[PDB]
Write an enzyme that holds these catalytic residues in place. Structure first.
Site, PDB file in Angstrom:
ATOM      1  N   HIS A  54     -13.139  -7.223   1.341  1.00  0.00           N
ATOM      2  CA  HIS A  54     -12.364  -7.442   2.556  1.00  0.00           C
ATOM      3  C   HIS A  54     -12.881  -6.912   3.793  1.00  0.00           C
ATOM      4  O   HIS A  54     -12.242  -5.727   4.090  1.00  0.00           O
ATOM      5  CB  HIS A  54     -10.746  -7.101   2.343  1.00  0.00           C
ATOM      6  CG  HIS A  54     -10.093  -7.780   1.300  1.00  0.00           C
ATOM      7  ND1 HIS A  54      -9.884  -9.063   1.260  1.00  0.00           N
ATOM      8  CD2 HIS A  54      -9.555  -7.280   0.030  1.00  0.00           C
ATOM      9  CE1 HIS A  54      -9.372  -9.321   0.041  1.00  0.00           C
ATOM     10  NE2 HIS A  54      -9.167  -8.567  -0.694  1.00  0.00           N
ATOM     11  N   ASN A  90      -7.554 -12.145  -4.132  1.00  0.00           N
ATOM     12  CA  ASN A  90      -7.207 -10.879  -4.731  1.00  0.00           C
ATOM     13  C   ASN A  90      -7.909 -10.228  -5.843  1.00  0.00           C
ATOM     14  O   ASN A  90      -8.445  -9.664  -6.028  1.00  0.00           O
ATOM     15  CB  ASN A  90      -5.644 -10.921  -5.451  1.00  0.00           C
ATOM     16  CG  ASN A  90      -4.940  -9.756  -5.750  1.00  0.00           C
ATOM     17  OD1 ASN A  90      -5.634  -9.156  -6.594  1.00  0.00           O
ATOM     18  ND2 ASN A  90      -4.173  -9.125  -5.076  1.00  0.00           N
ATOM     19  N   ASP A 149      -0.076  -7.048 -12.448  1.00  0.00           N
ATOM     20  CA  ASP A 149      -0.993  -6.856 -11.414  1.00  0.00           C
ATOM     21  C   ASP A 149      -2.214  -7.364 -11.966  1.00  0.00           C
ATOM     22  O   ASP A 149      -2.471  -8.920 -12.041  1.00  0.00           O
ATOM     23  CB  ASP A 149      -1.281  -5.317 -10.760  1.00  0.00           C
ATOM     24  CG  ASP A 149      -1.961  -5.354  -9.541  1.00  0.00           C
ATOM     25  OD1 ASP A 149      -1.408  -4.587  -8.621  1.00  0.00           O
ATOM     26  OD2 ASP A 149      -2.962  -5.984  -9.306  1.00  0.00           O
ATOM     27  N   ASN A 150      -3.369  -6.641 -12.439  1.00  0.00           N
ATOM     28  CA  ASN A 150      -4.273  -7.321 -12.996  1.00  0.00           C
ATOM     29  C   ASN A 150      -4.411  -7.635 -14.604  1.00  0.00           C
ATOM     30  O   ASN A 150      -3.749  -6.584 -15.467  1.00  0.00           O
ATOM     31  CB  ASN A 150      -5.648  -6.528 -12.553  1.00  0.00           C
ATOM     32  CG  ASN A 150      -6.021  -6.424 -11.099  1.00  0.00           C
ATOM     33  OD1 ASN A 150      -5.461  -7.335 -10.549  1.00  0.00           O
ATOM     34  ND2 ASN A 150      -6.751  -5.348 -10.737  1.00  0.00           N
ATOM     35  N   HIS A 168     -12.392  -5.205  -3.958  1.00  0.00           N
ATOM     36  CA  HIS A 168     -11.068  -5.468  -4.476  1.00  0.00           C
ATOM     37  C   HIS A 168     -11.151  -5.742  -6.001  1.00  0.00           C
ATOM     38  O   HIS A 168     -11.698  -5.203  -6.510  1.00  0.00           O
ATOM     39  CB  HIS A 168     -10.340  -6.476  -3.868  1.00  0.00           C
ATOM     40  CG  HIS A 168      -8.827  -6.575  -3.846  1.00  0.00           C
ATOM     41  ND1 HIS A 168      -7.943  -7.437  -2.924  1.00  0.00           N
ATOM     42  CD2 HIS A 168      -7.893  -5.980  -4.747  1.00  0.00           C
ATOM     43  CE1 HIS A 168      -6.633  -7.426  -3.455  1.00  0.00           C
ATOM     44  NE2 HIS A 168      -6.691  -6.323  -4.353  1.00  0.00           N
ATOM     45  N   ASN A 207      -2.037 -12.847  -8.639  1.00  0.00           N
ATOM     46  CA  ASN A 207      -2.786 -11.768  -8.363  1.00  0.00           C
ATOM     47  C   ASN A 207      -3.967 -11.475  -9.374  1.00  0.00           C
ATOM     48  O   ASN A 207      -5.002 -12.193  -9.382  1.00  0.00           O
ATOM     49  CB  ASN A 207      -1.618 -10.609  -8.733  1.00  0.00           C
ATOM     50  CG  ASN A 207      -2.223  -9.092  -8.159  1.00  0.00           C
ATOM     51  OD1 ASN A 207      -3.154  -8.735  -8.690  1.00  0.00           O
ATOM     52  ND2 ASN A 207      -1.376  -8.444  -7.207  1.00  0.00           N
ATOM     53  N   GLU A 215      -8.994   0.071  -8.317  1.00  0.00           N
ATOM     54  CA  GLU A 215      -8.181  -1.040  -8.398  1.00  0.00           C
ATOM     55  C   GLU A 215      -8.373  -2.213  -9.565  1.00  0.00           C
ATOM     56  O   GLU A 215      -7.580  -2.709 -10.235  1.00  0.00           O
ATOM     57  CB  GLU A 215      -7.970  -1.858  -7.005  1.00  0.00           C
ATOM     58  CG  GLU A 215      -6.756  -2.743  -7.050  1.00  0.00           C
ATOM     59  CD  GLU A 215      -6.871  -4.131  -7.570  1.00  0.00           C
ATOM     60  OE1 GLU A 215      -7.730  -4.514  -7.525  1.00  0.00           O
ATOM     61  OE2 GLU A 215      -5.694  -4.943  -7.847  1.00  0.00           O
TER      62      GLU A 215
HETATM   63 CA   LIG Z   1      -4.926  -7.107  -8.080  1.00  0.00          CA
END
Ligand SMILES: [Ca+2]
Ligand SMILES: CCCCCCCCCCCCO[C@@H]1O[C@H](CO)[C@@H](O[C@H]2O[C@H](CO)[C@@H](O)[C@H](O)[C@H]2O)[C@H](O)[C@H]1O
Ligand SMILES: [Br-]
Ligand SMILES: [Ca+2]
Length: 329
Positions: A108, A142, A243-244, A89, A198, A37
């Site tokens: 998490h 996140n 997203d990232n 994450h 995010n 991720e």
């Molecule tokens: Ca992310």
């Protein structure tokens, strides 16, 4: 009104299909099958990759100086971390004046969030756990961007911690997601009111902070001040869920992993899997930032891209729960 269906369709981009944008020579990274991720590449070409996100967990290492780099699992040592619940994450790195490399990892364990601080021990291929960070202002973290060994900006993708409440929060469109500055004796909210904040990153000179707002399809640019405070400078809009964010330290360019269609990534269907998309953003302060789709496909090779970064002409792309792709630009 039932203009709630309309908000849902635009937030989740439910009509988007992907025009392909191919690269020469893409290879799946052998041994990554359960997510990649987030990832961060050091100046020397070592790449950290978080995997096994649920929503077993590992931090992987690739040496991108190798012709066909293999992944290895980094060994976590120390007695201050319980690895049996390790569920990593977003990550970020920080290199101290003495060249010590710190890796900060969003974790998490169950429903909660912490940020785990490790010291990377290069010769040993291992991570020495140092500290577990948690805070009321880090309810649902996140990603983070490290500005010191235990100093970072963190996105909270939701205001609530309980997954049932998070789900209502998201579907109600509250947009209560917020960003926190964390340091040993100064933790504060620095920006707020996002719809699923995010990705987050910083310019190489430390003067600007970039924040991906997933469900608004936006990247926010903030000036970062000497007192660590952020002020809004501009907002870029896209036709994809962002997203990232990775930042190339040489140019300052942004490299962003995206989800073209929100339905496919939030409501997984093996017969209609999520695709992948990587944007490059140049001159982000100019009047017309240059946005290029560098790689895009519908998931017949790589599903659910979240992150992308470049190193000496190679592009490494990670996903939320699938594989990783390594490409020549
Ligand atoms: Ca992310
Ligand atoms: C502003 O912060 C928050 O934003 C949302 C919309 O963004 C507001 O209003 C929100 O709640 C209502 C209540 O059911 C939702 O149906 C609506 O779709 C949503 O817009 C909230 O009242 C406010 O607390
Ligand atoms: Br898609
Ligand atoms: Ca990150």
């Amino acid at each position: 009104f039932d203009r709630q269906k309309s908000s849902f369709q635009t937030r989740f981009n439910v009509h988007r299909e992907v025009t392909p944008v191919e690269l020469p020579n893409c290879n799946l990274v052998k041994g990554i099958d359960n997510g990649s991720e987030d990832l961060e590449i050091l100046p020397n070409g070592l790449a950290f990759i978080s995997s096994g996100l649920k929503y077993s967990g590992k931090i992987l290492l690739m040496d991108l100086n190798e012709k066909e780099p293999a992944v290895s699992e980094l060994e976590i040592i120390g007695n201050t971390l319980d690895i049996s619940s390790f569920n990593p994450h977003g990550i970020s790195t920080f290199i101290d004046d003495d060249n010590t490399v710190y890796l900060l990892v969003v974790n998490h364990p169950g429903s909660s969030s912490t940020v785990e601080v490790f010291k990377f021990q290069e010769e040993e291929k291992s991570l020495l756990h140092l500290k577990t960070i948690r805070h009321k202002l880090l309810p649902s973290v996140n990603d983070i961007v490290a500005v010191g060994p235990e100093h970072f900006y963190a996105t909270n993708d939701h205001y609530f911690i309980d997954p049932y409440l998070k789900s209502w929060e998201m579907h109600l469109g509250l947009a209560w997601s917020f960003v926190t500055y964390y340091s040993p004796n100064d933790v504060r909210v620095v920006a707020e009111g996002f719809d699923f904040a995010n990705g987050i990153n910083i310019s190489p000179d430390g003067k600007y902070v970039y924040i991906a707002e997933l469900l608004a399809h936006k990247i926010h640019v903030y000036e970062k001040h000497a007192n660590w405070t952020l002020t809004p400078l501009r907002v870029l809009s896209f036709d994809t869920l962002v997203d990232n964010i990775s930042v190339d330290p040489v140019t300052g360019d942004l490299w962003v992993g995206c989800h073209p269609n929100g339905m496919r990534i939030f409501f997984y269907d093996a017969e209609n899997p999520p695709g992948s998309e990587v944007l490059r953003i140049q001159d982000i302060l100019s009047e017309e930032p240059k946005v290029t789709v560098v790689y895009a496909e519908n998931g017949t090779v790589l599903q659910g891209s979240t992150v992308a970064a470049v190193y000496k002409g190679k592009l490494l792309i990670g996903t939320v729960f699938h594989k990783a792709l390594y490409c020549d630009l």
